[PDB]
A paper describes a structure:
In strong agreement with these findings, we have previously shown that in the Gram-positive bacterium Corynebacterium glutamicum the MksBEFG system (a Wadjet type I system) is indeed involved in plasmid copy number control. Unlike the classical condensin systems the Mks system from C. glutamicum contains a fourth subunit, MksG (cg3103). Our data reveal that MksG is a novel, divalent cation-dependent nuclease that effectively cleaves DNA in vitro in an ATP independent manner. Our data reveal that the plasmid defense mechanism by MksBEFG is executed by the MksG nuclease activity.
To get insights into the function of MksG we determined its structure by combining low resolution X-ray data at 4.6 Å resolution with high confidence Alphafold2 (AF2) models. MksG is formed by two domains, an N-terminal (N-ter) elongated domain formed of mostly α-helices as well as an elongated 3 stranded β-sheet, and a C-terminal (C-ter) domain with a central β-sheet, flanked by α-helices. The C-ter domain forms a dimer in the crystal by extending the central β-sheet. The N- and C-terminal domains are connected by a flexible hinge region. A structural homology search using DALI on the AF2 database revealed that the C-ter domain is homologous to the topoisomerase VI (Topo VIA) domain of the Rec12/Spo-11 meiotic recombination factor. Structural comparison of MksG with Topo VIA shows that the TOPRIM domain dimerizes, in the same way in both proteins, to form a DNA binding groove and allow for double-stranded DNA breaks. Sequence alignments and the structural superposition with the Topo VIA subunit of Methanocaldococcus jannaschii show a conserved position for the magnesium binding residues essential for activity. The N-terminal domain of MksG is positioned in a similar manner to the 5Y-CAP domain in Topo VIA with respect to the TOPRIM domain, but there is no tyrosine candidate in the equivalent 5Y-CAP domain that could have a catalytic role. The only tyrosine within reasonable distance for a putative catalytic role is Tyr258, located within the TOPRIM domain. A modelled DNA molecule could be placed into the putative binding cleft formed by the MksG dimer and the distance between the two active sites could be compatible with double stranded DNA breaks.
Residue numbers in the entry:
A (entry chain B), B (entry chain A): 21 to 388
Amino acid sequence: MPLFIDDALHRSKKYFHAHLSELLLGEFAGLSLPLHPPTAAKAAADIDATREFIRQWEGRDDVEYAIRNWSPVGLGKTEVPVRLTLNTTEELVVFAQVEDEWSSLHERFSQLSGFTAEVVAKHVSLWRSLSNDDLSKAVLVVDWFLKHPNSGLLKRAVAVEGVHTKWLENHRVLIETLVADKRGEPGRADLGLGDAEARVRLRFHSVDAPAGLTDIEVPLSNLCELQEPQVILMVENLDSFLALPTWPGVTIAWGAGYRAVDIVRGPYFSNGRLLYWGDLDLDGFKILDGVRSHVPHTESVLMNSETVSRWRYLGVADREFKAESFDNLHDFESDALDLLITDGELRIEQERIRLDVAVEEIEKVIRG
Amino acid sequence: MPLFIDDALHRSKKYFHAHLSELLLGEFAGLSLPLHPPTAAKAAADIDATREFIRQWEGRDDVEYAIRNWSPVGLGKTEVPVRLTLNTTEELVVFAQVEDEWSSLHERFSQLSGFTAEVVAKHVSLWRSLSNDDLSKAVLVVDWFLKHPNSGLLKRAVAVEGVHTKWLENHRVLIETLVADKRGEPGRADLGLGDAEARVRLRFHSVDAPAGLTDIEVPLSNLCELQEPQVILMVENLDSFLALPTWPGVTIAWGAGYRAVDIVRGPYFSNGRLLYWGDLDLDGFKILDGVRSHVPHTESVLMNSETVSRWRYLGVADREFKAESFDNLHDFESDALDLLITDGELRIEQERIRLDVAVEEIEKVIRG
C-alpha cells in the first residue's frame, strides 16, 4: 500500500522513540522506508488519491523518485515517489517532528556526562521525564552514596538538599544503577541503606529489672547488654503476655505472632530454657514449629491435648485452615493440632484460657 | 372496621412485645380490643365477609357478643362479636401465641432472681436473647466486679471462665447495670476497669544508656526508675527521631504526634530542659501549644520563621487547615505559623529539612 506522508511521520516518530538509546550514543544506522508507489491499475482506479500521494512527496530532497510508464491506462510516463531515506539523526528528528523532545533529551543527557554515556543511554527510560532539578539532586545523591557506602543509615538519613525519602525511593532503581556505574559494578549497586527496627519486648521481675526497668522494648542488637536469662517465656498473644505476673529469674518475651521466628535467631534466646505459649490453632503451632527450627529445646506450654480438651468449648472455627506439615513439632503437639483439626478446624485463642489456670500450668512447667 | 382474628392475634403479640417489662413484673393491666361489628349496611353489602367475621369469633369464652337488629336488611336479629378482652397474662400469652417465648423469658428471668426484679424487667431488651450459659457467665462476672471494685485491670484480666474480652465488651452495658444494682448505684456502675495506656520511646547516648540499652520503649509508669535527664529532645516525626545521633546528657523522646501532650504529663519531662521539634504545619504547632500547656519552659527547635523561610520551597498545602488559636505559643511561633498560613496553608514536614542542618540547629540550641 502507498505510504502517505502522515504515515511516514508516524513511523519515523515511533522509530525515534524505539531507538532513543542509540541516537544519544550517535549510533544511528539510518532509516529507509519504501513508499510502494501504486501499480498502473491502482493509479487508474483512484486517480485523485494517487495524485495526492505523489503531491505529498514532491519537492523533498530526501525522497527518491522513479518514472513509471502508465501509458496503458492513459497517464503516460509519470514520475512517482518510491522511497524515503533519512541518513542522519538531524534528518530523522526534524522529519519526525521531535526537535523539542530531542533537545530536552540531550540537555538532560549532557547533565549526565559524568557517567558512562553507554549506560546512561541504555536506561534513558529512567530519566527522560525528570526535571533538571531532579537530575541535579540525583547527581548529589549519587555522590552521597559513593562517599557513604554501606552507611546502614535509614533512607531519611540521606542529608542531601531537596531529597526526601519518597523522592529517593521513587528514583531508587536509577540511583542504584548510577552508583553501580561509578563503582564499576554490574547492574545495580547495593546502596547499603539500612532499615533497623528489629525490636522485641521483655518483662522482668523487679529483682532482675535492668536499672530497675521491669517492662522494656529494645532492638535485638541491644540484647547483648542484658544478663543471660535462665528461663524465657515467649507469649504470642499480647494481652496474655501483659496480664501475667513476673517471676524471679524468668524473662517474659512477647512473641508478636510470626515475628517470634525472626526474634529467636538472637543468641539471647538460646542461652536459657525457652518456653513458648501460643494460640491453639494452625498459626500458633506453625509459629512453634518455626521457633524450634532455631531453638530446638523450645518447650510448648498449654499447647497439649489436655489443655485443648479442657478449653475446646470456647474454640471457634479457624477460617483460614490449610493442612500444612510441620517438622519440628513433638508427637504430643501433632496430636493436639490433629485434635483441633478434627473438631472442625478449631481456633482456641489464648484469651479464652482462664488467666489463673494458665499461670498454674506455666508455674508447673517452669518449676520442673 | 371489623377486626378479624388474625388482626387481633397480631395486635396482641405486638402489645406483648411492647410491655415485656410489666408482664415479667406481674403488672398486666389487661387488654381490651373493640371488634367494631359491621353496621347493618355493611353487613348487607358483603354478607360472606360478615359471616366470616362472626364465625372467626364464635365459641370463644373471652369474647363479648351482642344482638344487633338487621331486620331492615333482611337478616333479622343476629348476634355479633363486639369485643375481645384478655384479663390475665396467661390469656394474653396463649392468645398471642407466644407460649414458648414467654417460658424462655421467665426461665431467663428466674436466673436473674438474685437482682432486683424491677430493674431486670426494665432492661429485658439487654438479656432476652442471651443463652442460659451467657446468663451464668454474666452472674459470675457481676460477682467478679463486686469482689474487685476499681481493679484498674485490663478487660483481659477478668479471670472468669468462658469470659473473653470480646464477650465482656459485647454485654458491657448489661454488666454495668447489674453492678449498679448490687451496689445500689443509679443507672450504670463504673466497672473500674483500666486501660494501662502509656508507652513513651527514648534514645540515649551510650554513656547514659540504662544497663547499656540505648533505645528503649517503656510505659510512662516506669520513668521513675531512670536517672533524671538534663535535656529532653522530643521529636514528632519518627524518621527524624531515629536518624538523629545521640548525645551525652541528652535523652531523645519520640513525641508520636498529639500523643506528646499526654506523654509530657509525666514528671520525667519537667525535670529537664524540654526541647520540642515538630512539623511546620498547624498540627505541629498545636502539639507544641499542648506540650507547653503542661511544661511551660518547653523550647521549640526549627519551629521559627527563619527555618520556615529557608525550607518553604519544599512545603505542601496543609489540606485540613482550620484557623485555631493557641494560647501557649511565643510570638516567634505565632509569626511562624502565620507565615505558613499566608503562603497558602503550607505544611513543611520535618523530613524535608536536611538532617545535617537539623542536627546543626539542634546542637546550637542545646549548647546555649
